[PDB]
From a paper:
The E. coli 50S large ribosomal subunit is composed of 33 proteins (L-proteins), one 23S and one 5S rRNA.
In addition, we noticed that the 5S RNP (ribonucleoprotein particle), consisting of 5S rRNA, uL5, uL18, and bL25, can dock on a pre-50S particle as soon as the central region of domain II has formed. This can occur both in early (d12-CP, d126-CP) and late assembly (C-CP) and goes along with formation of domain II helices H38 (A-site finger) and H42 (GAC), as well as domain V helices H80-H88, representing additional examples for rRNA induced rRNA stabilization or folding. However, the CP remains mobile and upon rotational movement of the 5S rRNA towards the subunit interface, H84 and H38 stabilize each other. The presence of domain II apparently facilitates docking of the CP-forming 5S RNP and as a consequence, route 1-2-6 involves the possibility of CP formation either on d12, or d126 resulting in d12-CP, or d126-CP, respectively.
Author numbering:
A (entry chain F): 1 to 177
B (entry chain W): 14 to 81
C (entry chain O): 2 to 117
Write the structure that this text describes.
RNA sequence: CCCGAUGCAAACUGCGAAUACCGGAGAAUGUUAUCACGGGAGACACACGGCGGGUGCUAACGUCCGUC
RNA sequence: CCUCCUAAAGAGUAACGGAGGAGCACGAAGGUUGGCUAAUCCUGGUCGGACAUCAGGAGGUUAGUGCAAUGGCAUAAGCCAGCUUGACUGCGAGCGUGACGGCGCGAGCAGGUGCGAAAGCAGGUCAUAGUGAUCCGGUGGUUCUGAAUGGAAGGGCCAUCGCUCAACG
RNA sequence: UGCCUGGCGGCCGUAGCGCGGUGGUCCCACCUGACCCCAUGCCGAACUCAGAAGUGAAACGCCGUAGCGCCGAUGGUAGUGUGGGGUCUCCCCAUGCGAGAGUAGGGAACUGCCAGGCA
């Protein structure tokens, strides 16, 4: 509970004062983070997919899980059941550690960082975005870079609507839009 | 030609191990003392009186043989 | 949904064993308590049951549902069935896993005089 | 590409019987008119008309199906 | 040979009709036990233009179910996984099909097995086409028999193989 | 015997969709931790283990709401068996059976056993 206890101590009180809920846990809470990767150009060979899987495993505390293509299409030249990428689901302490380390250091160290797109929601109160050039994280050593790729981080929130999602995002001070 | 359809109906006496209905699909399901072959040909596992019922949330049709 | 998933998983085995038209034993696992029941082939009557909800079993149990409570429920249901004479009813694990306390209660019932 | 309305489909039916088939009970009548076996047969190019149809150019006094 | 209508609500039912599909294949694509459930649309984003993975919602089987098609599949008959080969041996009441040989289903019995804690299931494939009666030939086993006797040849029985006879009871 | 909550069945949309109110007495649910029973084709996602720390937020329970789904008479209509007729390509007459759709009406279901709290 590196940040769970601190989160409950700090964010809950401010949000309750903001909304004045009748229950302590009515505040939206983070459940998990989906760490997908939309390379879209791993069809050439499996070496790139293996490298991306290794990078994701190094980033997190657990091995990633590969996923297959939902459908086969001709425009994109995709067969059925073709593995195109891998994802990671974090629940417990690893997710808290990942969130704290990305918010603390990762967010400021972005070139031309115009800020997170508030309107870029899922339409119900959850946020999902891809910060490209994942080299920002120190875990990805500069000497150990093969090709430029992008991340797909989705925050799972219990927000009833978009307003609660905005409130939860601002609870982390929302550096700027 | 292939003989399909129903050959035993409600209230019709049937002996043990007698075909009740043939069907390419499964328009009926075994009820009580009713079997089901590989070809979905319903048959009775014991002597009795045939009967058709409508049951299930989806309004399915079942064939059941009441014991004599 | 969780409840929908559990009931849809259980109903398959329920109907499969009901096809024989024989007595069944159904045990429901709850984080607090444990429920047990024996159902006749008719399916609209109860013959024997015992759960931790009643105070008659919680005297020796610190918690409502646990290993000790599961064992006590097993003993209670076995004794009640034997005195009533269910005569080797079938067992259904409420479409749940026979991997937790379900195994413990099943073993307790078996050693208590259940032939299922 | 899709949606609302508007008509049809023998190879569509979220609905759907009169009629014909089978199963059970029943008063009445029918030279058992019902069924099994055995001996002995004839025929094995049918026509016309009604009914619901396919084909046919819904032209046919054309042709082909099942019932009478 | 098979799928819907024609074919007129039992079944069957003509025509040089409308549409056609097949001679396959699997030692897993089967059985067991466990877990799961989709086509499609919108919103956001690195290549993304209207259609790559992902997050959410709507949707609730309109996909998938190997075949061209029909009827079914949510308890899924579909998907993933632990084991295995019950695709075993001798049988099998009774039922349906037809003019007929014959063909299909088939509860249940005895022996031994696989799965599942057990209850229980397993005698091939979601069902409906994948076939070739007929004699002849290659191989191995079987004293069953052997034209007076001991043997041999020959005959008999068991298991496999040679097929657009596409014209294929 | 009266109210509330749970399991087991019938009924299979008169049981459904949506809206409002409402629930922590018991019970139920969310949930902390999981190094231990146990598991992730990664993830305590699901199963399982130790609880009332906190809550009824969410699911679900109950009442109302007929906006929305359904059935549904009565009558009429088309259709059809039987016998006849016409102007026989089609229709009518006497008689029997009688559609679909839609109208009135309904309901926010009902029902049997036990258990825990409230009485």
């Amino acid at each position: 509970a590196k940040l769970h206890d601190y989160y409950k101590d700090e964010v809950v009180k401010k949000l309750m004062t903001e909304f004045n809920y009748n229950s302590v846990m009515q505040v939206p809470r983070v459940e998990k983070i989906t760490l997908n990767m939309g390379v879209g150009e791993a069809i050439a060979d499996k070496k790139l997919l293996d490298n991306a899987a290794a990078d994701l495993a190094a980033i997190s505390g657990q091995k990633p899980l590969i996923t297959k293509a939902r459908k086969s299409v001709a425009g994109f030249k995709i067969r059925q059941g073709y593995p195109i990428g891998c994802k990671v689901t974090l629940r417990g302490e690893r997710m808290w550690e990942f969130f704290e380390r990305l918010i603390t250091i990762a967010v400021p160290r972005i070139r031309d960082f115009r800020g997170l797109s508030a309107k870029s929601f899922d339409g119900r109160g959850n946020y999902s975005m891809g910060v490209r050039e994942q080299i920002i994280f120190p875990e990805i050593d500069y000497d150990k870079v093969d090709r430029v790729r992008g991340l797909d981080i989705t925050i799972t929130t219990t927000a009833k609507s978009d307003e609660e999602g905005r409130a939860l995002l601002a609870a982390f001070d929302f550096p700027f839009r | 030609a292939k003989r399909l359809g129903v050959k035993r109906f409600g209230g019709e006496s049937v002996l043990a191990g007698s075909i009740i209905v043939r069907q390419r699909g499964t328009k009926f399901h075994a009820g009580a003392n009713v079997g089901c072959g590989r070809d979905h040909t319903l048959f009775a596992k014991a002597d009795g009186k045939v009967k058709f019922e409508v049951k299930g949330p989806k309004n399915r049709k079942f064939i059941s043989i009441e014991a004599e | 949904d969780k409840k929908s998933a559990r009931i849809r998983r259980a109903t398959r085995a329920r109907r499969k064993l009901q096809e024989l038209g024989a007595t069944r034993l159904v045990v429901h696992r709850t984080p607090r308590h444990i429920y047990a029941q024996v159902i006749a082939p008719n399916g609209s009557e109860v013959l024997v049951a015992a759960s931790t909800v009643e105070k008659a079993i919680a005297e020796q149990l610190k918690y409502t549902g646990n290993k000790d409570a599961a064992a006590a429920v097993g003993k209670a249901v076995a004794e009640r069935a034997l005195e009533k004479g269910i005569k080797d009813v079938s067992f259904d694990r409420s479409g749940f896993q026979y991997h937790g306390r379900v195994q413990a209660l099943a073993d307790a019932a078996r050693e208590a005089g259940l032939q299922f």
